[PDB]
Paper text:
Nicotinamide phosphoribosyltransferase (NAMPT) plays an important role in the biosynthesis of nicotinamide adenine dinucleotide (NAD+) via the nicotinamide (NAM) salvage pathway. Here, we demonstrated the NAMPT-mediated salvage pathway is functional in the Gram-negative phytopathogenic bacterium Xanthomonas campestris pv. campestris (Xcc) for the synthesis of NAD+, and the enzyme activity of NAMPT in this bacterium is significantly higher than that of human NAMPT in vitro. Our structural analyses of Xcc NAMPT, both in isolation and in complex with either the substrate NAM or the product nicotinamide mononucleotide (NMN), uncovered significant details of substrate recognition. Specifically, we revealed the presence of a NAM binding tunnel that connects the active site, and this tunnel is essential for both catalysis and inhibitor binding.
We obtained two apo structures from two types of crystals, namely the tablet-shaped (1.79 Å) and diamond-shaped (2.08 Å) crystals. These structures had almost identical overall conformations (RMSD, 0.3 Å). However, since the structure determined from the diamond-shaped crystal was incomplete in domain A, we focused on describing the more complete apo structure obtained from the tablet-shaped crystal.
Author numbering:
A (entry chain A), B (entry chain A): 1 to 226, 256 to 271, 277 to 285, 290 to 395, 406 to 468
Write the structure that this text describes.
């Protein structure tokens, strides 16, 4: 809300005091963002566009400066009042930085440069450091998009072995139920949007608002009432049909919440097969008539795979089941899941660039044209050093103006094209 | 930001369709919030006041209804347009609900009623259900406040065995460095504020903005530049002093980030003792002269206790060291950490209350006057059933108006008074 609308106070307390730590006569500073490893060996990049639009949505003002100066003095931190007033009076309150990033949705192996931030004004060289806190939080939409993208690759494998329509079934196979279990409305919106990079099903209305506000997508995702109707049940209740109506369900998705996630799915399949029959698809796997099952409980990339391995062995196609994740998708991730870091790699002393500290200097990302494989390099080795690759970063933000910017449908295109 | 400013879309998709699921002729609905167990056996209650102020900050409008009606139809969910227009035209857009809660900061054992939500209009009985999603997220400030409060009890034990000034040293012994590692600015503000329920040190400027906006506290917490100055070092660097300046540090906190959290603290203590001496306090423990140590790395209630057990055995007072937590405090928690639930326990059929489903009916919380112990009971058994206890809940919100409401200094009073 409005009470957070001051970019000068959207940072760590010690970062306000940080401009005094630079050596004398420094003209510039260079930073980069990377994942230093963790659970997965690649990450789908997403979220930066939303973070820039929301966190940097207006010029800094003298009011912002008055408020920050006052709060931080009583808080115990020095504040560069004169440096910030210079930015407002001389630069119209526009942050003198350049941000380059891999196009959102692209899946990049770990230990690679994903974004770079460089200063564009000699006197306000310290501004990138000031923004470390709000930029580093990009770890969250990247990690959520990565978790979601890794689920997609698992489902896709099994929909490729079974199923006559793998890519037509895949977009509806992981549903977001995370709005209850996420830490804030803003995290529900951003993290839910990161899931929509990979799938179409979501119960996080907050994700539709962010995608339509930041990624130019009026309605990014769909759901059904709980025409396709989901009824919440329990494999014992379905077994008690031994009686009841059936046929008016022939003239349905079942969401269970009772039992081991792997088991109750297998039982629902065997019960609903007895109680609906099946067709045998072109790959030789059974597709239930009329009914499908969504396991929205205890779902994580491990139990996810266990369910699919188990129902595939039993002769049932992966078409029959879809999955739901809540807190395990939007909340049970952290900055160390993908070991995310924002590092300074270069400063300009004297008017001469020097490295900092194995990744040093002014850096970018290269994409090999033949193979599509990513590697990080120094900007001095892009052109006239590589007619075999192109610079993979694009300048998305500079000096207050957002340049390159994506629809959610472009983000999904990059992510859908990447495989493991 | 403004793009989230529609309470009708701050919910789960299926909850919009939820009013059709109630049996015919229902006049009311009763809900309650509790922790069903988890890591700890008690929880410090906090955050509801901020959630109400920010999520329910204005009357619902016909514009909200037009927007929700449109988005949800294209999304795939039914929407009670006529029910919401009734709320705006007949009730001024004020939510017909009553919310009662234990005063914030109070520490309540698990499996106890922490809040209740009851409808106050017969025709709009379904409104509490609509708000389940945004209310249940109270798990996050409660869990963060609980984690922080549990750290406090550990530090307090050791400051009671060592240290001549336990309660004067305790407020500065856990510092929040979580702004980098939390999932959103809003989570940084709310979760950081939950830490300030217990301590005064924070680097999360976002927490000061929320506390001054929602808990009437102009500056809730303090920090130091990194007069008390923190220098970031490394036990090997301190050992290389074997030379250098020392004395102008007599005319300092050391923040290390290299090595096992338990070890490097013990070494820094032994090195700085060699390199500064100590005084022996009234309890017989050594207090270093001039220098202190803050371990802001690898800190969790387990390694926290290990450090204190180790330095206490070595004869050093707990005054000598302070601690820092980042993602382990603000992000590495989830809804299952304290098994948080929002359950419906009573509906009104016919004009007659019936239970739902072991906790059923219209419920409240009692506090025994003699012992201060909490238990949950039915509202029908408060007065003329217990001259030995008082109803422990207070009505904080009703029909659009916030009633009882706290300063952060009142919240801290309740939490500081509770012990394990």
């Amino acid at each position: 809300m409005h009470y957070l609308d001051n970019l000068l106070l959207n940072t760590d307390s010690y970062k306000a005091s940080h401009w005094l730590q630079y050596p004398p006569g420094t003209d510039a500073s260079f930073f980069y963002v990377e994942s230093r490893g963790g659970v997965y060996d690649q990450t789908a990049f997403f979220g930066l566009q939303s973070i820039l639009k929301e966190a940097i949505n207006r010029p800094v003002t003298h009011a912002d400066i008055d408020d920050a100066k006052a709060l931080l003095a009583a808080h115990g931190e020095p504040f560069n009042e004169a440096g910030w007033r210079d930015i407002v009076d001389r630069l119209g309150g526009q942050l003198p930085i350049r941000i380059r990033a891999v196009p959102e949705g692209c899946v990049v192996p770990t230990h690679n440069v994903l974004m770079t931030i460089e200063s564009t004004d000699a006197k306000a060289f310290w501004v990138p450091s000031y923004l470390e806190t709000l930029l580093l939080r990009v770890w969250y939409p990247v990690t959520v998009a990565t978790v979601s993208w890794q689920v997609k690759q698992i489902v896709r494998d099994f929909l490729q072995r079974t199923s006559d329509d793998p890519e037509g079934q895949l977009p509806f196979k992981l549903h977001d139920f995370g709005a209850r279990g996420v830490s804030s409305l803003g995290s529900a919106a951003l993290g839910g949007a990161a899931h929509l990079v990979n799938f179409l099903g979501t119960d996080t209305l907050s994700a539709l608002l962010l995608a339509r506000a930041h990624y130019h997508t009026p309605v990014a995702g769909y759901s059904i009432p709980a025409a396709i109707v989901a009824v919440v049940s329990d494999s014992y209740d379905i077994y008690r049909a031994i009686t009841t109506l059936r046929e008016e369900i022939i003239a349905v998705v079942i969401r269970p919440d009772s039992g081991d996630p792997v088991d109750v799915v297998e039982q629902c399949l065997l019960l609903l097969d007895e109680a609906f029959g099946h067709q045998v698809n072109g790959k030789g796997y059974k597709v239930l008539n009329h009914v499908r099952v969504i396991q929205g409980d205890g779902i994580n990339p491990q139990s996810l795979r266990a369910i699919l391995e188990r129902i595939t062995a039993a002769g049932y196609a992966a078409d029959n089941v879809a999955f739901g994740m809540g807190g395990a998708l939007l909340q049970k991730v952290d900055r160390d899941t993908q070991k995310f870091a924002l590092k300074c790699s270069a400063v300009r002393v004297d008017g001469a660039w020097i490295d900092v500290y194995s990744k040093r200097g002014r850096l970018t990302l290269l994409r090999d044209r033949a193979t599509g494989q990513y590697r990080s390099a120094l900007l001095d080795e892009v052109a006239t050093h590589a007619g075999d690759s192109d610079d993979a970063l694009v300048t998305v933000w500079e000096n207050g103006q957002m340049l390159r910017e994506w629809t959610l449908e472009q983000v999904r295109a990059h992510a859908d094209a990447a495989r493991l």
